[PDB]
Write a protein that binds this ligand. Structure first.
Ligand code: RBR
Lengths: 209, 211
């Protein structure tokens, strides 16, 4: 099928450049335009520009005319976008889409999350949460002080799924992130398996009263 | 540089109701596009060239409008239609622009939260830092107030809030407030209370503990 696979997340220092890939498959790459979209949490979507792989011709939004640079490698069927001299305003999820025959983006890529920071990675400190309002009782994990995002929290290596709420990460005054993952169980063992890929911090933890 | 203002900012709808979101443009535009985005996933083309439906888009969706006011309408809401809808304009002029999006949430009865307090872990107390967590479980609507109080004194600035996305099953939200103070200031005090104010609660609920 028609697929668009984007490159992995980037953590790049401000002032430096970043180059991301969108590997196209399942269609004649050189026949349809590829567009790039910026997505910052809260300020909607932004059109960066498009490129026709069979020509290398490109349209840019005058906003990003000097920020982004679009290229194509027709041999490997990959389209590229380079973001030069990065700033905090460039931290966003970058989507890559194929413009279809019927004048609409029919296929998209999963996206690449760009985090623009000079700070080096930080593994989280996992802490347990002490195990009754509303007939139920709760326990959990505090994944505290880590950078960048994200962390993957599961319970009983995936066995426990019901009543689990993995809260969204919060930015702390310290500049580091911190999320909670709580599992609600009523009157009738519990292990949390935290995983931070950026600093290879896979930490298991048993929550006991 | 046509500015597309989308309204409402967020709205609620019970399955079966007629939903209509508007996209007002700063100047006249040639065409109007709409995208459906759910969390964790890339957007999806919903409506193209002001009124056509994209592949997969069901019959209940329809879009229309002209000049400075275009709209997306769902004849009868479904549970899977809870998502953010962004509009996007096209015109001979070059910057194709987008709206800030309308988040479409599901309506339901008011439900009071379940409150739980969490004293700092012994492991974290060794680390010289103390974190008291307060959980507000399964409640509706999203607006809930959390006042941390230490020895009856209102705390400020050292708390961080986080709210889950609306539940797939019961359509309620959960919230967590984390009070984080140094081990030094933690031992300077005894009673740690968490005061929750909500529409579903007749009077505020206070879960607490003594150090
Ligand atoms: C990805 C690249 C696409 N871009 C623009 C390009 C835009 C097109 C430019 C030419 C237009 C001619 C005509 O007036 C219309 N008819 C053609 C025949 O059939 C009936 C309607 C619409 C028309 C095709 C436009 C529709 C929206 C088009 C695809 C836009 O795409 C979107 C998604 O907005 C986005 C950025 C700049 C280029």
């Amino acid at each position: 099928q028609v697929q668009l696979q984007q490159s992995g997340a980037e953590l790049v220092r401000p002032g430096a450049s970043v180059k991301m890939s969108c590997k196209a498959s399942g269609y004649t790459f050189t026949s349809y335009w590829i567009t790039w979209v910026k997505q910052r949490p809260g300020q909607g979507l932004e059109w960066i520009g498009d490129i026709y792989p069979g020509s290398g011709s490109s349209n840019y939004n005058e906003k990003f005319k000097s920020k982004a640079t679009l290229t194509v490698d027709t041999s490997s069927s990959t389209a590229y976008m380079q973001l030069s001299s990065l700033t905090s305003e460039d931290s966003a999820v970058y989507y890559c889409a194929r413009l279809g025959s019927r004048h609409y983006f029919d296929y998209w890529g999963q996206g690449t999350t760009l985090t623009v920071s000079s700070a080096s990675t930080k593994g989280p400190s996992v802490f347990p949460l002490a195990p009754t309002s509303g007939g139920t009782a709760a326990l959990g994990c505090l994944v505290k002080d880590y950078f960048p995002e994200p962390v993957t929290v599961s319970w009983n290596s995936g066995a426990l799924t019901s009543g689990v709420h993995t809260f969204p990460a919060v930015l702390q005054s310290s500049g580091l992130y911190s999320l909670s993952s709580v599992v609600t169980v009523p009157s009738s063992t519990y292990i949390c398996n935290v995983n931070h890929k950026p600093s290879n911090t896979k930490v298991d933890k048993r929550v006991e009263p | 540089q046509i500015v597309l203002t989308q309204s409402p900012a967020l709205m609620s709808a019970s399955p079966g109701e007629k939903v209509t979101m508007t996209c007002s443009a700063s100047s006249s535009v040639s065409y109007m596009y709409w995208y459906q985005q759910k969390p964790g996933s890339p957007p999806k083309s919903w409506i193209y060239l002001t009124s056509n439906l994209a592949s997969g888009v069901p019959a209940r969706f329809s879009g229309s409008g002209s000049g400075t006011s275009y709209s997306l309408t769902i004849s009868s809401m479904e549970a899977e239609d809870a998502a953010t809808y962004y509009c996007q304009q096209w015109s001979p002029n070059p910057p194709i622009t987008f709206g800030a999006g309308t988040k479409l949430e599901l309506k339901r009865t008011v439900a009071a939260p379940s409150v739980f307090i969490f004293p700092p872990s012994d492991e974290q107390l060794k680390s010289g830092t103390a974190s008291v967590v307060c959980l507000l479980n399964n409640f509706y609507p999203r607006e809930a107030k959390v006042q941390w109080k230490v020895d009856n004194a209102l705390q400020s600035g050292n708390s961080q809030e986080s709210v889950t996305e609306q539940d797939s099953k019961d359509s309620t939200y959960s919230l967590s407030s984390t009070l984080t103070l140094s081990k030094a200031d933690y031992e300077k005090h005894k009673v740690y209370a968490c005061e929750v104010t909500h529409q579903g609660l007749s009077s505020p609920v206070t879960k607490s503990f003594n150090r």
